[PDB]
PDB file of C-alpha atoms in Angstrom:
ATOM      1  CA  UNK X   1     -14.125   4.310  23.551  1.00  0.00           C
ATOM      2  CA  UNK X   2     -13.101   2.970  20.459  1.00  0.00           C
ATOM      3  CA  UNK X   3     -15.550  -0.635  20.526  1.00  0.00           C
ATOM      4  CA  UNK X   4     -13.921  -2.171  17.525  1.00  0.00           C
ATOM      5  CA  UNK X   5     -12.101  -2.040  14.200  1.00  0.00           C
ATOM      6  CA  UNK X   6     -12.883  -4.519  11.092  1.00  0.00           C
ATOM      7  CA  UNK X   7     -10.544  -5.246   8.736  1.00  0.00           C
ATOM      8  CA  UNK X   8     -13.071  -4.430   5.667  1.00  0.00           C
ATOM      9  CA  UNK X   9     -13.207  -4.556   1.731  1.00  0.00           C
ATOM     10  CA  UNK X  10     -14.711  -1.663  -0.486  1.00  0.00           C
ATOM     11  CA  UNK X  11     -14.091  -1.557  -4.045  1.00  0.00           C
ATOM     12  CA  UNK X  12     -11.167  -4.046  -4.116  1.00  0.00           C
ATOM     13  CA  UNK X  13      -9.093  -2.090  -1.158  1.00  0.00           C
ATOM     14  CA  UNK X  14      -8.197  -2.886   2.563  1.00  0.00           C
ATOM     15  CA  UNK X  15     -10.177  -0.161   4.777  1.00  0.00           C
ATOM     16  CA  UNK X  16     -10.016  -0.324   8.164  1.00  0.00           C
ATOM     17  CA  UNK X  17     -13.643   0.187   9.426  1.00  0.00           C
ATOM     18  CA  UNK X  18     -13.929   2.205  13.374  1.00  0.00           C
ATOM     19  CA  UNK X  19     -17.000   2.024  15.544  1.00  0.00           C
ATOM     20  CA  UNK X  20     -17.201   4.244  18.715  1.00  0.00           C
ATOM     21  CA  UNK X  21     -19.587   4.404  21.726  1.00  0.00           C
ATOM     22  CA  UNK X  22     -20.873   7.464  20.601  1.00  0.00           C
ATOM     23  CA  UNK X  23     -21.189   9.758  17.417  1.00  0.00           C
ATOM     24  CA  UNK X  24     -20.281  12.545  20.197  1.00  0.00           C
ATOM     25  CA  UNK X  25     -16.837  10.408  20.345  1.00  0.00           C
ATOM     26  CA  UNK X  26     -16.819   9.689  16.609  1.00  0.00           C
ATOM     27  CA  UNK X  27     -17.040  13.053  15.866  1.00  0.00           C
ATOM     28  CA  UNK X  28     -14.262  14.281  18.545  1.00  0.00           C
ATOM     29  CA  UNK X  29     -11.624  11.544  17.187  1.00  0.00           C
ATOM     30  CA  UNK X  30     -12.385  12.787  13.608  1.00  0.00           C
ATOM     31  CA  UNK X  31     -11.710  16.167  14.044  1.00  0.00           C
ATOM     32  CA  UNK X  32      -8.623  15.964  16.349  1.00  0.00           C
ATOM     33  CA  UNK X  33      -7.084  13.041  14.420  1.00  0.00           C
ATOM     34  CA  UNK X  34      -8.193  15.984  10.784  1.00  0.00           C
ATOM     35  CA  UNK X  35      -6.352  18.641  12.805  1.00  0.00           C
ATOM     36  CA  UNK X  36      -3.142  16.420  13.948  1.00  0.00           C
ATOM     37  CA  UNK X  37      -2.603  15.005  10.107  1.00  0.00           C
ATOM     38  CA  UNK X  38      -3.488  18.837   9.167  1.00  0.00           C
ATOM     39  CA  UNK X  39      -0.317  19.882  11.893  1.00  0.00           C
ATOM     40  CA  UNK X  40       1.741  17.603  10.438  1.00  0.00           C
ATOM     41  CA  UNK X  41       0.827  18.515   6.358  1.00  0.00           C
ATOM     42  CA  UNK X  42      -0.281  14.791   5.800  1.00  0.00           C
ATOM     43  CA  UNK X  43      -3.950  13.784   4.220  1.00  0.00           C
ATOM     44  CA  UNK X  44      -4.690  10.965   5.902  1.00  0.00           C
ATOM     45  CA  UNK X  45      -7.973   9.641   4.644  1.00  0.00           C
ATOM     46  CA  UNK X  46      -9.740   8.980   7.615  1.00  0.00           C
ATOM     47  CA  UNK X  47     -13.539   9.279   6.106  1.00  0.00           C
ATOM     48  CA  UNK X  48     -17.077   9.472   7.625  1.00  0.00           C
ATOM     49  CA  UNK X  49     -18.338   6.054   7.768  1.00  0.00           C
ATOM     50  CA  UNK X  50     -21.608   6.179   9.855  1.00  0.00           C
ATOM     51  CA  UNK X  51     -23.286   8.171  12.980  1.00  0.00           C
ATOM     52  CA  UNK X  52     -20.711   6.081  15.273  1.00  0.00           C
ATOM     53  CA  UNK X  53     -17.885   4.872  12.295  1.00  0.00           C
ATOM     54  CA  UNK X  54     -15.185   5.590  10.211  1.00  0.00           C
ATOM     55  CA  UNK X  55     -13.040   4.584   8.302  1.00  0.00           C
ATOM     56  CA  UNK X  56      -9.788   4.586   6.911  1.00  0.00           C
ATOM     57  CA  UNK X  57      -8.935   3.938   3.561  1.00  0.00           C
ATOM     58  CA  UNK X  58      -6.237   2.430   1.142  1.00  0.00           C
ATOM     59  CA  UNK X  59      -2.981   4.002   0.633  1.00  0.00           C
ATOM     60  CA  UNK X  60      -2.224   5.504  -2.949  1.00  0.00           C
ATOM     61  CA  UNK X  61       1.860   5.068  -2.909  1.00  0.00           C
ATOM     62  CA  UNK X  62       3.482   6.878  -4.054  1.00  0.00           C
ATOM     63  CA  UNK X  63       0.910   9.651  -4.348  1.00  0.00           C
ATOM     64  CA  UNK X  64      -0.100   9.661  -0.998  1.00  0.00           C
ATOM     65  CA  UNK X  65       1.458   6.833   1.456  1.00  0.00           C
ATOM     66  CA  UNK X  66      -1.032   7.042   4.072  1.00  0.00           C
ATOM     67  CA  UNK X  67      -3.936   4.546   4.587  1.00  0.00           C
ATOM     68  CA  UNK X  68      -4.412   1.067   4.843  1.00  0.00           C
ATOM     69  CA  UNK X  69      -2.499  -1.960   2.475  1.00  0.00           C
ATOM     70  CA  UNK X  70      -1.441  -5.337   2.449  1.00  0.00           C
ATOM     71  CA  UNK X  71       1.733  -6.643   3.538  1.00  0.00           C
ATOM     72  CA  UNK X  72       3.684  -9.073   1.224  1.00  0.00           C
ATOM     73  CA  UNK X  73       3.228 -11.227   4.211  1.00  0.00           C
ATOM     74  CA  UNK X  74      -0.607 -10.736   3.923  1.00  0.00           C
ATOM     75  CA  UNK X  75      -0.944  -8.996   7.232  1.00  0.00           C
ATOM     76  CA  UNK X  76      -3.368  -5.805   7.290  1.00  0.00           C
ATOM     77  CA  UNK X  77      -0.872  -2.470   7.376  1.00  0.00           C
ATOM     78  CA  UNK X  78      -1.795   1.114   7.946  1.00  0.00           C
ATOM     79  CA  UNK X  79       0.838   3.929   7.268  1.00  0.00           C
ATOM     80  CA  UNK X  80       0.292   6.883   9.143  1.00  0.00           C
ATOM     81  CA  UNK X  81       2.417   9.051   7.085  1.00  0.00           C
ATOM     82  CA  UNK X  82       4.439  10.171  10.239  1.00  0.00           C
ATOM     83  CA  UNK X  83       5.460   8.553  13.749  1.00  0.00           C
ATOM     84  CA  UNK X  84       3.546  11.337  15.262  1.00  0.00           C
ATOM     85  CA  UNK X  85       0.271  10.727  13.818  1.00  0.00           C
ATOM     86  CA  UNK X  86       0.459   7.195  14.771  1.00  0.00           C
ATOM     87  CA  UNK X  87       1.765   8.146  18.154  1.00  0.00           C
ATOM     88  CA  UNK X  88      -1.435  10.250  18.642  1.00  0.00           C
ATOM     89  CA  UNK X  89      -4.765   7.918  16.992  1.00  0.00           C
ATOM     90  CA  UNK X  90      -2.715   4.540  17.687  1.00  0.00           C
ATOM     91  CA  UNK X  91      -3.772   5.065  21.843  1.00  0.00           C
ATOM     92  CA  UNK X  92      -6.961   6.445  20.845  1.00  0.00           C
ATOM     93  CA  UNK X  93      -8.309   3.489  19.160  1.00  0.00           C
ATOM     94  CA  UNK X  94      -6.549   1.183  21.884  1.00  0.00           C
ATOM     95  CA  UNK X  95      -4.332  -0.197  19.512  1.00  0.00           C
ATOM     96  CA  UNK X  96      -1.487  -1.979  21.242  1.00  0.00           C
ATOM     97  CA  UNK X  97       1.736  -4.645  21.036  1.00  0.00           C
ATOM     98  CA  UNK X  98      -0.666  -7.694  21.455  1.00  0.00           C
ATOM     99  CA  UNK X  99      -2.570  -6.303  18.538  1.00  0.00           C
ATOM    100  CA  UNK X 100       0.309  -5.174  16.229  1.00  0.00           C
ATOM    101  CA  UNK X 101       3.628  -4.799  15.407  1.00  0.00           C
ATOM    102  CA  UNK X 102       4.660  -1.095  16.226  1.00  0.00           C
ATOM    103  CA  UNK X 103       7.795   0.107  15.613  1.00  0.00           C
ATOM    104  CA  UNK X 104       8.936   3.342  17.688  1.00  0.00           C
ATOM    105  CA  UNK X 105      10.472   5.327  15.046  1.00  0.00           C
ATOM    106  CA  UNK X 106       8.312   4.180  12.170  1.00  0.00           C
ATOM    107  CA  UNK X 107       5.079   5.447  10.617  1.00  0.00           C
ATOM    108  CA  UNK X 108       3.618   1.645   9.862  1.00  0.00           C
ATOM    109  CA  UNK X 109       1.925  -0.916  11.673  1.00  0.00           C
ATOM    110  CA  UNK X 110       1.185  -4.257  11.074  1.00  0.00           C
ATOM    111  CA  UNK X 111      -1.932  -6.108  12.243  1.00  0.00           C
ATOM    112  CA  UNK X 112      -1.193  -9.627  13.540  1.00  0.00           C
ATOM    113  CA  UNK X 113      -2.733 -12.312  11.499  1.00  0.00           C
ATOM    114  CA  UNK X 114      -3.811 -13.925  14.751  1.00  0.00           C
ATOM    115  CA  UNK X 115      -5.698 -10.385  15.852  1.00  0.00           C
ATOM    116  CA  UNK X 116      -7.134  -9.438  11.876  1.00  0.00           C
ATOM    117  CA  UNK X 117      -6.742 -12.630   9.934  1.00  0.00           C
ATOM    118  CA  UNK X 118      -8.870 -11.405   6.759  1.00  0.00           C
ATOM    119  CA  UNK X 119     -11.865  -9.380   5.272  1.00  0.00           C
ATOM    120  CA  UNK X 120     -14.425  -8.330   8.008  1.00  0.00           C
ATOM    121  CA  UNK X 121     -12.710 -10.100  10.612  1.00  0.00           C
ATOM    122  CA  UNK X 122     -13.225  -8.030  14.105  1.00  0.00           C
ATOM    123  CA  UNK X 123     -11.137  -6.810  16.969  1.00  0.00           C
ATOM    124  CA  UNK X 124     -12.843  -5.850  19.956  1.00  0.00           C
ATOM    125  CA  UNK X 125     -11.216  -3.581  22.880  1.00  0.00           C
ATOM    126  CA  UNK X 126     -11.290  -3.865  26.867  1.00  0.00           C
ATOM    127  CA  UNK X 127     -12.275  -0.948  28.429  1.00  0.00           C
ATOM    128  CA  UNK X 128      -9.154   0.607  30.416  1.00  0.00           C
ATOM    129  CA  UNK X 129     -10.634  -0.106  34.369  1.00  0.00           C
ATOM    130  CA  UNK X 130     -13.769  -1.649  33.487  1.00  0.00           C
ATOM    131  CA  UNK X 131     -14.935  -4.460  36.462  1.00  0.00           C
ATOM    132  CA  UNK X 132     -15.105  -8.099  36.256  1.00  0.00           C
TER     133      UNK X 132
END
């Protein structure tokens, strides 16, 4: 699984920072989540962070709308370019209403401030059937 996501801060710019169990896992997710944004003609910069991270990286609108920005509001956003890719990583990562606001036809999310109030604040994930 996906263990967490950090709201993070590299050279001025909202990333959004992804640590998995494995770098087997890592390394599945970033090639399936390459060849979905590859299906779909979008370059979504989802970079090599670590052995067992990633990360994905600031929007350049209107160059290239995907990646991660802030909201007016202040809330952490990532635009995914299409609804599909964000269909396909959003369940992937575990991302879900009580962490966001997702929209079904839209290719933006937006962290709640509750959930990802600011720089290198931390969400952690429950595993799907995991016991007591």
């Amino acid at each position: 699984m996906v263990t967490k996501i950090i709201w993070v801060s590299n050279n001025g710019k909202p990333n959004l920072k992804i640590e998995f169990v494995s770098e087997e896992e890592k390394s599945n997710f970033f090639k399936e989540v390459k060849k979905k944004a590859s299906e779909l003609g979008l370059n979504f910069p989802l970079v090599q962070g670590s052995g067992n991270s990633l990360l994905i990286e600031a929007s350049n609108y209107p160059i290239n709308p995907c990646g991660c920005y802030i909201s007016p509001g202040g809330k952490l956003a990532i635009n995914f370019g299409k609804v599909e890719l964000s269909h396909f990583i959003l369940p992937k990562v575990g991302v879900k209403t009580e962490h966001a606001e997702i929209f079904k036809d839209h290719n933006t999310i937006f962290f709640h401030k509750h959930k990802l109030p600011g720089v290198n604040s931390e969400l952690t994930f429950i595993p799907t059937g995991t016991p007591v």
